[model samples]
Target: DLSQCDREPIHLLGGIQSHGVLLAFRGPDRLLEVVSANAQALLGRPPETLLGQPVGRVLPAEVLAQWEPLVARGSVRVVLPAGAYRALLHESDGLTVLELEPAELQPGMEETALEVVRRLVSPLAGVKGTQALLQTAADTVRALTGFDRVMVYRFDADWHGEVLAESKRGGMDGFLGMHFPATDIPVQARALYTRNPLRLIADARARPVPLLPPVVPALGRPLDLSNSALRSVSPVHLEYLRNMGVGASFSLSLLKEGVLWGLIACHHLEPLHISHERRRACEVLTQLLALQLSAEERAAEASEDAHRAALLGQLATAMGEGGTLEEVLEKESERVLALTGAAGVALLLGEEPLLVGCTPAQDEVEALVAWLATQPFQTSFHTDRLGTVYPPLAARADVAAGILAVRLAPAAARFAIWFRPEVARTISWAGNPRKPAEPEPGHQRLHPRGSFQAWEETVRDTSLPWKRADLGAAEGFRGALV
Candidate 1:
């Protein structure tokens, strides 16, 4: 799925912000070995004139000392000839990277507002509902910032983003129920989001200024902007926003258990900026939402386990008082299958094979069981595309497109399997998920896909997706039955 991964060379953008300038220094000496071409505009010195000069000669020594420390604290604000600048610092390849951005947005805050929010968030602690919490989060953030549109874009395990919940201005085309491929946020961008936490694209269509010795002559590579806003964004992404009619965007990620869970995707149809105090407020709201999202997910997993336990309890009692394993299995097949919304059920017990509901033919089922003996699985297995995982399963698609199999006996691969039949479905794409946009000749900026047609992909050999709850149920069934 490299196509889906979005082939991108984001680090090689070979520049910094036109609005601000970047200066890369070497070692503790803090010698400015590299400067952006825009240094003339920012510092009244051409990059060539400033090359290999001490950082003290440029900005205050006080600001230069804070470079290493303040980077971790995000950015430090300083006023230069160019309005206001937020200075950020980082280290890579043994070189110190300093980035400066127009400082319209600051990381300052008010404790009074936070105290009011703390009280408001207390009520959400008991709010066990998932979608409701997501909606409230979206509403609160939108109301706080007055962004034209605010969406809760959640990432699946595979990194695909979906609009889980949204608050938008009237008549804005709704992206509320759409899917965005992983490429929409590629490697470098995701890395920055993780470190930077909150990012602002004050103006998406702003021109990019060049770096003087863009690539450090010493390292022979462009400075990596893994955390700070001093770096310019990918040209491809800017064009992507232009296609969506978005002139400005801001993002604050939601994290749970030390991993990214989703994002607060705020959009505006015009260039917009947030105050330092307002930006800090947005950051605080992100923390509150993340904590609740974590609590809600754990609660759901616990609830699913309870249902599995109750179902297995009755089945176990019935089996203990049964006439035969097959008869006992047949009678409880629907209950077991219903646990996961599977269309069929089968059991391979002790030495006999027995099956009920809309299962594959006996031989087909036997072949699948034999195949499982060779592959590695924990307690159970689940897949929406059985055919894709086990090519042989494709031939039996009508009755067996997906299989959630639980090993019943630890000694052998004797198991219970649930199946779902293949479904023919058409999925819409904003653009072709399998390809990048057509390349335009004579343009330096690489354009993102320009057309967002109703491109439809007809998918087959797949059934309803097996969610985490279903996966947990299968494992619980194995624990109770075995």
Candidate 2:
């Protein structure tokens, strides 16, 4: 059923949220190619009259004068006949999308924005750990947004999300340590979040405004609103929020490099629409947090890197000084475990694998090695749930719950594989992930779960995950052999 999730063309939702208006401009002259159906209400001009008009004539002279810089910067404040507005801009498939929404600025807005930046970035310099950094963000964001709950939800290797930190109003149930199945936020949703870092659903009940003609004549299709700030999201997502009793929600994507690292979820029980400035402030705060997160991860990796190189250096020295592969592994058996923080290792350089530390039985080892040989790994392969992928080892998870394997010879079956013991534990879910999708009568659509209570599940046959440093060390050691 998850396959059906992305089938809904979210970008071509054919409409946009009612809070703002979306307009598409095409050609060198920037002719208005498409406008939201609700344009008349916000712009004092009907979509029928707006289409085919030039953007230069539609927008004020102030915006036109600084047009190039606004396109480059992606946002600009402009005064229109309707009122003061924030214009968000982006280009897609040769058409430039201009999204406009009411600014709703308050007195001392500039000062308050600066203060928000100072409060968020100042304390980060002194924060020594990731938990402290995340906690600070959760608390600060909750206060700034006035949301009932704000949680820092981080995604694991398998895309399952866990609540790393939370700040909520009094009497509200907390989801600080709960996990949510990947099914909750489908794959396509995650991709969109990366493309548009800030998504605010002022109210789930609000109706969407459709595009004027529902299609652009020049492109012969619906305008691609992937980058539109006012683009309407999938209906399934709105229902998901309603099921959770959330009236308003905002999320900022946490990215490491360009990939999604997690999300900063802000939830409220009543309909709320934040001004464009406030949302921009939240976006800035999240960007700073992502940078700080990268630094902390690198700092941790640096320490691990030092120890890993030392171990590799010692083993390579022995091998270079006429020590055989078998003898070198035997002499530095403990060091191999330290290199990956695993309980066991297997050196498969010949017909028989040389087992060391607390490895699997020989029968299991032979089967695993056979399975590995068929894999197309050029240098390395890793997985925390070895049993899940290679089902033969499912029951024998205690000895080899995970693996970090590196190929020494591409032409032959020479590898150094590390094994981690199973870590049996209990996980707390926000709701029962297995709840059957409800079907609407006489229709093919499915409904989201209606519960938000804590659901506990006992997880097994998984081990402590391998870090970036471990994989790097494994690859480094493999290069030494080559």
Candidate 3:
């Protein structure tokens, strides 16, 4: 399934946060050619007054002298040219861009800084397990950021997500065990997150200002604000959160292998803005958290491989101490099932079928096996959705909805297969997944799915998800039999 959510041209929206002003100049010459519509309110200069003016005419002459220091020092500064509140400078699409946030959050105290470092360092120390590390990280983040809720949201292999851990204030209900669909955030939003790991939507209800001239006249494009610290929040997201009774959101991406694996999704009930200094500290914590998670996963995988290897070795001995293949299976059925957590197993040697544990009726098994023999498979076959792969399995989902088969011999059509019966489940979604978007001007899509009502999806004809250890153990058993 190609996730086409990236098709929205969010980067070229030409809108920005009202709390800050954006100044884009043509190339390295740094002329104030394009300015945010709200530049007048914040900078006392309108787009009309400053069009095509030299950089010195707009941004201060003396502060302009400190360009190299500003670039090196980064956005940690509390002041800018002409005493602008907070400044962030970056380059995009050959345009010199300067963004300045209002001055309220600036500079810090050594005592406060030293105190935060001590409490937030516990996860890096590895004093607890992975879940606790994530939970503590959530709570610590909430404490510093002063959010109503903070969730350490993790993604599954399928891109579906669950809130692995959370921290909340007041009597707010939590979403710690909730699951969300892949389409919840969309693709383009996730892609831009990698470019700038920290994103903030200060006020969900604030109005967005369009760039003067609507588009950059020279390039015939909108200013690329992908990396803008105060980039305008998406209307789709704003509406979604407003409906969910959230006033602000600050996302700190958790990156692994150079892509978004999860997020520290912080929410506020009142409009809030975290200072530049505090956010930088939060960013560091996210980096440390990601590294620790990767290390823990590798350790867990190693432990599973060692334990599974020992189980397979015992299974191998049992298979070798046999009379016929059926007798061997009878002696080792439980061992074989243990390798994959299979509910039932069948060994089809020649025409007869040897069934063990919970399997389908004999007639259905024979029919399915006969159907399988005609297929052109190389080594083995597996599927959790046997009903879709082999339609008749739909009716008997309670008996077998998944299968993993190993071919023993081509000549005799001898094979050993495992089956897992469907265990029905209900998945809770944060909202009704039928969110549809209406088209805006210029083919822009608002929200694909809008409501945040709690909804549930019942699953059938699918077994528990197979794990890496299950496959590794099954491979060892197949090798021993061959």
Candidate 4:
């Protein structure tokens, strides 16, 4: 169960990825409280020897100088006898969890980090459509980080993912246009993704370096690595990476108004590591991509509104030619359906409802209008999945899966509605979505799936989502007739 993944407490995994060192210091004296077992490799001091020492005595002067300032600024860079590293610091509980990773340059890139970020994301500014923007997003990420394959996977309202664009080197199967179930990422992991915008698996095969004491005495639990860049990921996730024939993977979250919208996912056939500075640059690019996508969607909505308004105007002109409201609706019913982008239109001004185009049975239409009267909508109400809300519509879902209903008279039960047929679409998943995991001896619930083969699924009982412009058009028609 995806919910089972939520109970794992992944943030308290009690270890760090061996690619970087994590240090936890306690109190005002900044005594080294918790250190990763790999501390000796990077800091030249074993974890046991550095456990109770003051940070100032253990680290060089440059690192010591950034202590209070690091608290003010989020990160600082220090060059040590061992290597130059990007020092990321954040306060947690009563400890400052400072993470350090080498400030290595991206392979074959020769520009400042800021310059590279600007150059990589600048392509998105010139694109005109949502498709172009998404494709450019994939290309930009692949260029910024030398990943073997990159793709943009957008989430639907149900949280299922569909790959929208892909940029990949030869020899790898493309994931573009494939779908993935929500359970693959799990519920808790999605929450963590919302907090941390970027996550990377430098080497999926590398072992995790456990914390020296396994638990921090001050916190009486594993250190929370939620904000740590080098946080060790779950073993299930590592197995997932291996299943896809990938040795390394990187993901950057795309947020819409602080909600998880999508992800820019990257994969490599060979073990790969991106520097901290370059990864931050990629984060900036992702933020810019999200903003640009919002702009494009708004522009498309505005364009659609203009066309819907034209249809509404034409309907108004026809009504001005002298005829009863029923007569005009009868004559312009097809136009009404076109105005709302629906396959059917229903008018219920009198005891008998007028139905046009493909629609539910006459008795079914009457029952739906009677039920709509009870809803607390002042003017208009719309839904893409009518069957879920009104169970009677479940049987007639083929013709009335979605509806946009508007009140014709505020005091009376007179109303008008446009209907859309069920899409009954087929989705091609990257793997068999039905079996995300299987029972294993050492694992909690199950182990990750080991398949990457394409699987097709037929979805029913839902229609194409109604656009905001479609609802506005119905309101415009209400104002015209009422």
Please list all clashing residue pairs in model 4, or write none if there are none.
none
For model 3, what is the error of residue 353's alpha carbon versus the real structure, in angstroms, after optimal superposition?
A: 2.6
Whole-model lDDT, model 4: 0.76
What's each prediction's TM-score?
A: 0.80, 0.79, 0.87, 0.91
- lDDT of all predictions: 0.69, 0.75, 0.71, 0.76
Best of the candidates, TM-score: 4
Q: Model 1 residue 378 lDDT?
A: 66
Give the number of the best model, judged by lDDT: 4
Query: What pairs collide in candidate 3?
Result: 435-448, 435-449
- Model 4 lDDT per residue over 179-274, tens place: 877776667888788888898886877777788677778667787878888878998788778778877888888886878788888988888777
Residue-level lDDT for 369 in candidate 4:
86
Q: Order the candidates by TM-score, highest first — what do you get?
A: 4, 3, 1, 2
lDDT of 2: 0.75
Write the residue-wise lDDT of candidate 3 on 1-482 in tens digits.
44335566777787687767677777566777568777776556677788777767776543466555667876634354445466768776666677767544434534555566566564355655677778767877787677778888777776778777777766876666667777656667776777778887878677788776677776677877777777786676677677666778887878757767888988787888876656776887787778777775867888877876776777667656654666667756776677776778877766677789788777888888778887777667777888787897677777677777667776556777777887767667766644434446765445545454568777676788767777556655666667
Q: Native-vs-model 3 lDDT?
A: 0.71
Ranking by lDDT: 4, 2, 3, 1
As for candidate 1, its clashing pairs are 36-212, 37-212
Q: What does the lDDT read for residue 367 in candidate 1?
A: 80
Cα lDDT for residue 383, model 1?
73
